[PDB]
Amino acid sequence: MEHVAFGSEDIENTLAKMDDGQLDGLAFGAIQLDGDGNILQYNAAEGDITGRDPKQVIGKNFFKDVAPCTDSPEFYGKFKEGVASGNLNTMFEYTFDYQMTPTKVKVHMKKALSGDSYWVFVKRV
Ligand SMILES: *C(=O)/C=C\c1ccc(O)cc1
């Protein structure tokens, strides 16, 4: 396992050194996005929540294609305001119900170390 705690204060620094393989070792769901909503990375722990197959979503748009539930001021509204402001760091509970059993999660969104990339972290509550 990759020993990194969900919500860590320097998680962006840590996850910068990892590759596709290493991100599969985390105890929580991790998704990388560009500033538009396209998925750049998707770890196996996230797949173990949504029934989604990582390889088949990478390149698709999160808010438009993959996960319509997040297309809301409560989720997508925060992302866009962060992508706009040049900073994002927020944690909240959400429910995923698209093509899946309604599942309650804790979500964490934080700007990455790179310029136009954002992290979405998911865990069960
Ligand atoms: C509503 O958000 C639907 C779905 C969904 C699919 C994949 C991931 O990673 C989160 C949420």
- d(CA 98, CA 118) in angstroms, rounded, equals 22
Method of elucidation: X-ray
Does residue 43's CB lie within 6 angstroms of at least one atom of ligand 1? no
Does residue 69's CB lie within 6 angstroms of at least one atom of ligand 1? yes
Amino acid, single-letter form, for residue 110 = K
Residue 12, CB-side half-sphere exposure with 13 Å CA sphere: 16
Resolution (in Å) of the shown entry? 1.6
Q: Compute the distance from residue 110 Cα to the ligand 1 centre, in Å.
A: 17
Contact between 105 and 93 under an 8 Å Cβ cutoff? The reply is yes
Tell me the two tokens of residue 62.
Answer: 């999160």
- d(CA 78, CA 51) in angstroms, rounded, equals 25
Nearest CA to ligand 1 atom 6: 67
Residue 104, CB-side half-sphere exposure with 13 Å CA sphere: 2
Domains of the chain, CATH where assigned: 1-125 (3.30.450.20)
Tell me the two tokens of residue 88.
Answer: 């994002």
- d(CA 99, CA 79) in angstroms, rounded, equals 23
